[PDB]
Structure 1
Amino acid sequence: EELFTGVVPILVELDGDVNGHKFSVRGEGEGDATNGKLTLKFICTTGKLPVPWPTLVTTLVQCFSRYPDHMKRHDFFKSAMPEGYVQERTISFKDDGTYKTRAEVKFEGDTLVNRIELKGIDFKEDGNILGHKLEYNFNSHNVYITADKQKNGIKANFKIRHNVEDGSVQLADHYQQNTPIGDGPVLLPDNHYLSTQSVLSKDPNEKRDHMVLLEFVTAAGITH
């Protein structure tokens, strides 16, 4: 919490396997929780990414959300720091495959590190994911968080809306659970949500398959 007062370096490491296609992503940048802001560049270090970059955005550090003062009692993510938390998700792409992800989010020295294993199964070879038919952009979402007292953690549920190149929308249902790594006490929040926004771009000097991401997230849903 006091660990987030300024700008914090971020490292993201993802190992993925989707319908047997193996890939790795490495991301580097910084987080400014005071303003809810993330600035990162991600590289596919194994060559071509076999799924669209937008499908990995949510997997690729909610401790950088801005929690307003009146919500300070509800910030599980920072309260678990520095020892961190496990973040697990199931992502269900409507009429296509699923991702299962397990990550650890924790400080390693001065750097906030998100280390992820992703397994994707049951994707259509000519669907929107393996067929690379999703637009290179991101919509603004609401991440609904609830406490899971018995697990000493939280759950989240939300839908990601991926614009498709034919003008339709590909929904991705997100089920999420977070548990602390360490033994120290954490905050168990009242129901609230994170309001998100982001933009995806390219670095014209970067020849590797990559994504530049700028993201802003603020907590809300508890009136002062």
Structure 2
Amino acid sequence: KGEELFTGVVPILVELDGDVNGHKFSVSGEGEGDATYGKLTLKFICTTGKLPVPWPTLVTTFVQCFSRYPDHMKQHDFFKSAMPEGYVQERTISFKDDGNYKTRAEVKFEGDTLVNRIELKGIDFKEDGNILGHKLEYNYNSHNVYITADKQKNGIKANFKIRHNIEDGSVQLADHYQQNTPIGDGPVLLPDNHYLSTQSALSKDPNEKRDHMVLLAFVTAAGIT
């Protein structure tokens, strides 16, 4: 069973290779997660230099297996049940009146460490828009991730809207469409409709000189009974 692997503190590694409008970049992330409290503590560093997109735009891409599923909802946790073999997470992030990100992530265990290997492809962005023009505030609003089952591919589907805060007080919408399918041929939990209550706090490490992001997140499942 996959949930038994999440009863304690599990180390996390995140590696991303990106390409947004021709601007190639790499990000290396480290940290730890505690699923019993749905707590995530992560630090990301841009290894290729300076990040060509704002850090808040990449938070969703940067391990829902650390979500806290209440006891009565434990039969609906797809994420943990796909482990140790894992799942392939694919997203189409559509920024309103701007471009889009197309992601492909492999989330699985490498020893006692949970790894997220991601490949991001961003296209059709405006050079003067909120993303490439770096007009977004360094924060993150609370939101809900709506999950639905996909029996045909033996995984799940997810739909949600992210509201990024612009420097002028406005809102940059980022619609998310998500598909997760298991890597292993092992049994997975196909869920009923529910949601993940997400909360994220973004900060900086005062001693770090490289382009980075420190993230603190809390994710809890709800919407049933």
Q: TM-score, normalised by structure 2?
A: 0.99
Q: What per-residue deviation string (whole Å, max 9, x for no partner) do you get for residues 106-159 of structure 1?
A: 001110000000000000001000000000000001000000011100000000
User: How far is 1:198 from its partner?
Assistant: 0.7
User: How far is 1:32 from its partner?
Assistant: 0.3
Q: What per-residue deviation string (whole Å, max 9, x for no partner) do you get for residues 175-216 of structure 1?
A: 000000000010000000000001000000000000000000
The corresponding residue for 1:191 is 193
Unaligned runs of 5+ in 1: none
User: How far is 1:29 from its partner?
Assistant: 0.2
User: How far is 1:80 from its partner?
Assistant: 0.2
User: How far is 1:170 from its partner?
Assistant: 0.3
User: How far is 1:58 from its partner?
Assistant: 0.2
User: How far is 1:83 from its partner?
Assistant: 0.2
Alpha-carbon distance in 2 for matches of 1:26, 1:196: 23
User: How far is 1:173 from its partner?
Assistant: 0.2
Q: What per-residue deviation string (whole Å, max 9, x for no partner) do you get for residues 28-74 of structure 1?
A: 00000000000000000000000000000000100000000000000
Partner-residue secondary structure (3-state), 1:41: strand
User: How far is 1:77 from its partner?
Assistant: 0.1
How many residues are paired up? 223
Unaligned runs of 5+ in 2: none
Alpha-carbon distance in 2 for matches of 1:13, 1:34: 24
Q: What per-residue deviation string (whole Å, max 9, x for no partner) do you get for residues 90-110 of structure 1?
A: 000000000000000000111
The corresponding residue for 1:57 is 59
Deviating beyond 4 angstroms after TM superposition, the runs of 4 or more aligned structure 1 residues are none
Superposed CA RMSD in Å reads: 0.3
Alpha-carbon distance in 2 for matches of 1:11, 1:89: 19
